[PDB]
Amino acid sequence: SEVEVLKALKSLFEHHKALDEKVRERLRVSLERVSALEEELAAANQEIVALREQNVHI
Amino acid sequence: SEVEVLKALKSLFEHHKALDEKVRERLRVSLERVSALEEELAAANQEIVALREQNVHIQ
Amino acid sequence: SEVEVLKALKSLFEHHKALDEKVRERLRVSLERVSALEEELAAANQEIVALREQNVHIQRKMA
Amino acid sequence: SSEVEVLKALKSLFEHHKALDEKVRERLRVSLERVSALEEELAAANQEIVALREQNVHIQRK
């Protein structure tokens, strides 16, 4: 039936669209996490140097 | 025609499947990178408090 | 692109519908025409029988 | 539903539409030819009516 097939197709496309957004939502959150962690790790490694050199002085 | 509509519909489905797989792999790679960075940061923070502990004693 | 293909499909369906209706109408007109003609032909054949029966009657009278 | 199943349904929908279409178009073909055939038969019957009517009036006077 026409209406039946058309319904099933629009159903599929919407199901696909929602899953796709879900994955791009996870991907987005992940790539933000990499940048945040790179920045934190940079600061941590700078702190390790300062603390090490402080101990050799003190 | 009937053929052109069927062709376009099949092409659409194929493209979506392939694109989804491509995005998911990008995601898999990124999640692994997050995991690696988390481990590195945990190691760095462990070293930091260890260094702070040494300082406490020297002081 | 999903939206355009669904519109294309709906349009094909509506086109098929319109064309089916046109041909169906042609068929209805032609079947009615056949029916009118079969009616006229049946009546003509009845007149032929009546005339042949009348001419048999006349020839009996004569013989 | 799955993509394969929906496409199979669609392909089925199309093939069935044409099955009924070309059968309607064929009914129309036979019917148009039937109209022509009946026009010839009716013309022949009217001619026979004329011949018989003429013969009828004649033998009546004979």
Dist CA D2 CA D10 (whole Å): 12
Structure tokens at A22: 């879900």
Is some CB atom of chain B closer than 8 A to the CB atom of A37?
A: yes
As a whole number of angstroms, the distance between CA A16 and CA A8 comes to 12
Whether residue D46 and residue C45 make contact (CB cut-off 8 A), yes or no, is no
Q: CB distance from C28 to chain D under 8 Å?
A: no
The answer to whether residues D35 and C33 touch, using CB atoms and an 8 Å cutoff, is yes
Using CA atoms, how far residue C42 sits from C30, D45, D55, in Å, is 18, 10, 22
- Give one DSSP letter per residue of B17-42, joined into a string: HHHHHHHHHHHHHHHHHHHHHHHHHH
D30 at the A interface (CB within 8 A)? Answer: no
Q: How do the domains of chain C map onto residue ranges?
A: 1-63
DSSP state of C1: -
C36: contact with B, CB 8 A cutoff: no
Interface size B-C, in CB pairs within 8 Å, comes to 15
Sign of CA dihedral D44, D47, D53, D55: negative
* Whether B31 contacts A30, CB under 8 Å: yes
Asked if the C-beta of D20 comes within 8 angstroms of chain A's C-beta atoms, the answer is no
Q: How far apart are CA C33 and CA A3, in angstroms?
A: 36
Q: Which residues of D touch C45 (CB under 8 A)?
A: 45
Cα of A5 to nearest chain B Cα, Å: 12
Total number of residues shown for chain A: 58
C-chain residues near B2 (CB < 8 A) = 12
Residue A35, both tokens: 């940048």
Residues of B in contact with D11 (CB under 8 A): 6
CA of D19 vs chain A CAs: smallest distance (Å): 15
| Cβ–Cβ under 8 Å, residues B41 and A37 | yes
Directed axis angle between helix B2-58 and helix C2-62, to 10°? 160
Do B9 and D11 lie within an 8 Å CB cutoff? no
Beta carbons within 10 angstroms of residue D45's beta carbon: 19
Q: Which two tokens stand for residue B39?
A: 């481990």
Resolution in A: 1.7
Q: What sign does the dihedral A26-A27-A28-A29 (CA atoms) show?
A: positive
Task: Report the 3 state secondary structure along chain A.
Answer: CHHHHHHHHHHHHHHHHHHHHHHHHHHHHHHHHHHHHHHHHHHHHHHHHHHHHHHHHC
Alpha-carbon distance of D42 to A34, in angstroms, equals 92
Interhelix angle A2-57/C2-62, rounded to 10 degrees, is: 170
Closest chain C residue to D58, measured at CA: C55
Close Cβ partners of C26 (under 8 Å, ≥ 6 residues apart): D28
Tokens representing residue C3 in the block: 């939206």
Query: In Å, how far are C6, C12, C15, D39, D57 from C18, measured between CA atoms?
Result: 18, 10, 5, 31, 57
Using CB atoms within 10 Å of the CB of residue B59, give its burial: 0 to 12 exposed, 13 to 18 middle, 19+ buried. Answer: exposed
The residue count of chain B comes to 59
Structure tokens at B21: 């797989």
